[PDB]
Nucleic acid binder design. Structure first.
Ligand SMILES: [Mg+2]
Ligand SMILES: [Mg+2]
Ligand SMILES: [Mg+2]
Ligand SMILES: [Mg+2]
Ligand SMILES: [Mg+2]
Ligand SMILES: [Mg+2]
Ligand SMILES: [Mg+2]
Ligand SMILES: [Mg+2]
Ligand SMILES: [Mg+2]
Ligand SMILES: [Mg+2]
Ligand SMILES: [Mg+2]
Ligand SMILES: [Mg+2]
Ligand SMILES: [Mg+2]
Ligand SMILES: [Mg+2]
Ligand SMILES: [Mg+2]
Ligand SMILES: [Mg+2]
Ligand SMILES: [Mg+2]
Ligand SMILES: [Mg+2]
Ligand SMILES: [Mg+2]
Ligand SMILES: [Mg+2]
Ligand SMILES: [Mg+2]
Ligand SMILES: [Mg+2]
Ligand SMILES: [Mg+2]
Ligand SMILES: [Mg+2]
Ligand SMILES: [Mg+2]
Ligand SMILES: [Mg+2]
Ligand SMILES: [Mg+2]
Ligand SMILES: [Mg+2]
Ligand SMILES: [Mg+2]
Ligand SMILES: [Mg+2]
Ligand SMILES: [Mg+2]
Lengths: 47, 361
RNA sequence: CCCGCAGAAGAAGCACCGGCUAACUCCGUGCCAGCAGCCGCGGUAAUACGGAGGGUGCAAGCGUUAAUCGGAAUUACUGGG
RNA sequence: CGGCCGCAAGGUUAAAACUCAAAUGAAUUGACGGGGGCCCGCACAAGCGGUGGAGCAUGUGGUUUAAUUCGAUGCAACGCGAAGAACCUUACCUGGUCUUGACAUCCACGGAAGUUUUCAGAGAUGAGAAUGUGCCUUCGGGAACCGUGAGACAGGUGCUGC
RNA sequence: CCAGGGCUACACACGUGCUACAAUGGCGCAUACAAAGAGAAGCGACCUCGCGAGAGCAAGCGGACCUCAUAAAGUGCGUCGUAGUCCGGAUUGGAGUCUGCAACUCGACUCCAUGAAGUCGGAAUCGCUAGUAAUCGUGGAUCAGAAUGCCACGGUGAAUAC
RNA sequence: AGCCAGGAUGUUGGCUUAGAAGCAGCCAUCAUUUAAAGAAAGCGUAAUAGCUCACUGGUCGAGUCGGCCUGCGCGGAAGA
RNA sequence: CGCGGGGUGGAGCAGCCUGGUAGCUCGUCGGGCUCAUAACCCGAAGGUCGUCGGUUCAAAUCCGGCCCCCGCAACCA
């Protein structure tokens, strides 16, 4: 239930300190077509 | 139909949220259980219990007794003009006008309960907005979330003052500090602490794909004028003794050194720099004035650190609203308010995201 | 062990179904909750999540961890560089 | 780390825990190079005339606003969609209103349609006041239009060019 | 469905255009030389009135015959003589015409008066090599009216490319 | 000055209609029954309840009380 | 409490000595350059000089008090 963040002590700010935690990291969606949209087999490889 | 009668159904719209939140049936039913608790002869032997309850029954009054009369007026205020518009009785037409002010002021009596949560509601506050890492997209959204509330603060009549600022290397900002000035500044924005969530197709990346970036907006009043050194000499035991002795017969005879021992705390403050007792007194009073105030700054931080300990364990519960602009949808994940009006949200349409957010919070 | 009962009467569950590896689609959740042995799936049309329909693999036993060997010619004398 | 050696810098012999599921070799197709060779274009060079400076037209970002409709927003958006916003356009904003409906097909009932004028109101509409009646061998209805009604639906310039 | 407002808001910034800074020029009078195109609840000569934008009357033409519609630069004479000048043209006030139910936010045009910025343009940057650049004028689509935009036609006509 | 009686009336008086109801900050100072009673001097109890004084009569019945101007004292006054 | 120097745009330093018009580098803001940022090129803005008082034709300048900062001194016993 309790999220274990990666900073021992927390001073002056809670929400802002969690902002620089890997819980709130940027999530980049791997696009389906275009740049960086190549796959070996993908999801179902039947040929 | 009638702007008067539809207004009554709009007071109903404001009432039903308060009906469902505090559970005015169970909130009412709680009173009769504590009536029998209070109606008792052996409650005088626990006067602290009855004093804590004697106003607790009154706290249940302004919530229940307001809503108990409020449901009656919904048919009453609507039914008065309904009979007045048939006979065209112009006085009875004007009689139901003040009847519109009957339940609304009672709704304003509950507006006290809406702003009851807080001890610095009418205080002026700061709007500190920090950006997540996210590359440049997070740098831009901090600016996009800045003007989100900067447009809204001026949309309501509050004075907006930008104190600090930090711009982006490429585009956007990094961490702006706005000080909202005026009364009820911290009261409305109290439900704005917490990280905001953005989901959109990022234009900064070349092969632009959907980035899920975050931004936090911590608010705090920071308004005080009370600083207590507690330099009251009823405390501060003073102890005078003689020095080590290097100046012959004189310094071994003169009780020049001094110690300042605090009576409640127990920290000692000695000083034997100069040669006079009058001179070492002020320096030892100065060092005691430092070490006592710096003890107060740690107790200020000790309660502050314990305050964050109820906030660091939350984790993925510090998210406030999800701005998923790829499908044009807004999600206030705290309460559950979904809106499809993202072009109007950036104008500051967060009044729906306060009435649902603050009364339920 | 052998004979008698107006009696089918008392006796069927357990994993898996993207590929490796037999076995397919719809609803609910939307990188959240979760799955895993490996590669990796979930970002509002998921046969990889959860729940049902069917299907398969076994069956009073299945499935998961744990230990050794095999696959490993990835310690090669048989049998490598 | 320990041992041996060295004046020293170090050399030599030489692990584990933990962590990833790849590290690496040759070769191949492209792209790229502040690599080479060759070639082309107003690209440069050689020139003329403009832009940025000044006023105005128009569009955009901003700011503002009840709203300043949405979209386009490196080159390849920015006198663009719009080959033309006083009403209309119009999708926007405020206020006033109607909802099986402004547009469509089906059904029952009551009526040919259509024409003229008055009152209330910003208007939408509501309330009326006079009048008339075309095709068949159903003629107690079919074919047209108006009106009320329930059920299927109608409608969307609402979202996703991912 | 409907009226009014808004898309035309305004400390700022940018892109794309028009018009100038003048004498290869402005202004006054007389005046030469084209192509393409459009037109029926449409374009609407002659004539009369007005300083004009136009108004009244009104044939012709749905078309190589009619109207739109005297093309403007250019040519000749005269004047201004290098100044913010008779350069320049915004803005504003007063008085009017057209279209349209309606010109206030918010039209176009005319008239009288007023008459700012601007004197060759910082960093930087753009177009073009033949009838092109530059420069001047007309028409059409759009459309009740409403462009310097777009589309298109025509007149004059270079420089340089070692 | 004592000893005997009352010490009331509306008034649980308006707080902001949680609780001081002659008593925390509440306000304001009413009129009557009158020998006599201040919406109050104190204690007290979440609050009330309850007990006295204010003020007034009877009674044993005379001087008595409160300040000021002053002489001389008292307490304040604890060191090897 | 003594002595000397100092307090000037957002930062660091000029100018004060011998009075009138306050400067330089960086930073800030706007526009170019690039696909974009940095840098670079160009333009513009920004401080009454800690505060109060006095003198003076005139005060950031001369003098004094106070607040603040730094250094020295704070000794023989
Ligand atoms: Mg049977
Ligand atoms: Mg599974
Ligand atoms: Mg499934
Ligand atoms: Mg093995
Ligand atoms: Mg090998
Ligand atoms: Mg050795
Ligand atoms: Mg070594
Ligand atoms: Mg060749
Ligand atoms: Mg769209
Ligand atoms: Mg163009
Ligand atoms: Mg409406
Ligand atoms: Mg008929
Ligand atoms: Mg009719
Ligand atoms: Mg596409
Ligand atoms: Mg309208
Ligand atoms: Mg537009
Ligand atoms: Mg306009
Ligand atoms: Mg001449
Ligand atoms: Mg004439
Ligand atoms: Mg004429
Ligand atoms: Mg002129
Ligand atoms: Mg004029
Ligand atoms: Mg130049
Ligand atoms: Mg035309
Ligand atoms: Mg053409
Ligand atoms: Mg006495
Ligand atoms: Mg004495
Ligand atoms: Mg004595
Ligand atoms: Mg000087
Ligand atoms: Mg800059
Ligand atoms: Mg002075």
């Amino acid at each position: 239930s309790r999220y274990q963040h990666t900073k021992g002590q927390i001073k002056d700010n809670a929400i802002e300190a969690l902002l620089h935690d890997p819980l709130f990291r940027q999530r980049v969606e791997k696009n389906k077509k275009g740049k960086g949209s190549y796959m070996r087999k993908g999801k179902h490889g039947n040929r | 139909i009638n702007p008067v009668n539809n207004r009554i159904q709009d007071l109903t719209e404001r009432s039903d949220v308060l009906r469902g939140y505090l559970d005015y049936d169970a909130k009412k039913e709680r009173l009769e259980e504590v009536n029998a608790e209070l109606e008792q002869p052996d409650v005088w032997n626990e006067p602290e219990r009855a004093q804590a309850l004697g106003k607790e029954r009154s706290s249940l009054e302004a919530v229940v007794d307001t809503l108990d009369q409020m449901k009656q007026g919904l048919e009453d205020v609507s039914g008065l003009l309904e009979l007045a518009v048939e006979a065209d009785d112009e006085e009875t037409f004007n009689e139901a006008v003040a009847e519109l002010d009957a339940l609304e002021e009672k709704l304003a009596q509950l507006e006290f309960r809406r702003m009851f949560s807080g001890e610095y509601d009418s205080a002026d506050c700061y709007l500190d907005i920090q950006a997540g890492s996210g590359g440049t997209e997070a740098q831009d959204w901090a600016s996009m979330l800045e003007r989100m509330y900067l447009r809204w603060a001026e949309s309501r009549g509050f004075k907006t003052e930008i104190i600090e600022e930090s711009e982006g290397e490429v585009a956007g900002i990094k961490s702006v500090t706005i000080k909202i000035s005026g009364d009820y500044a911290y009261g409305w924005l109290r439900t704005e602490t917490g990280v905001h969530r953005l989901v959109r197709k990022s234009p900064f990346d070349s092969g632009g794909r959907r980035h899920t970036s975050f931004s936090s907006a911590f608010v705090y009043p920071e308004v005080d004028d009370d600083i207590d050194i507690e330099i009251n000499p009823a405390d501060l035991r003073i102890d005078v003794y003689r020095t080590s002795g290097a100046g012959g017969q004189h310094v071994n005879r003169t009780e020049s050194a001094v110690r300042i021992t605090h009576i409640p705390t127990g920290i000692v403050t000695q000083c034997q720099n100069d040669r006079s007792q009058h001179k070492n007194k002020d320096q030892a009073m100065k060092q005691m004035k430092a070490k006592l105030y710096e003890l107060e700054m740690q107790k200020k931080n000790a309660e502050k650190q314990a305050m964050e300990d109820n906030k660091s364990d939350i984790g993925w519960g510090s998210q406030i609203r999800s701005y998923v602009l790829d499908d044009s949808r807004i999600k206030d994940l705290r309460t559950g308010v979904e809106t499809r009006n993202t072009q109007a949200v950036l104008d500051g349409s967060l009044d729906q995201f306060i009435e649902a957010s603050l009364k339920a919070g």
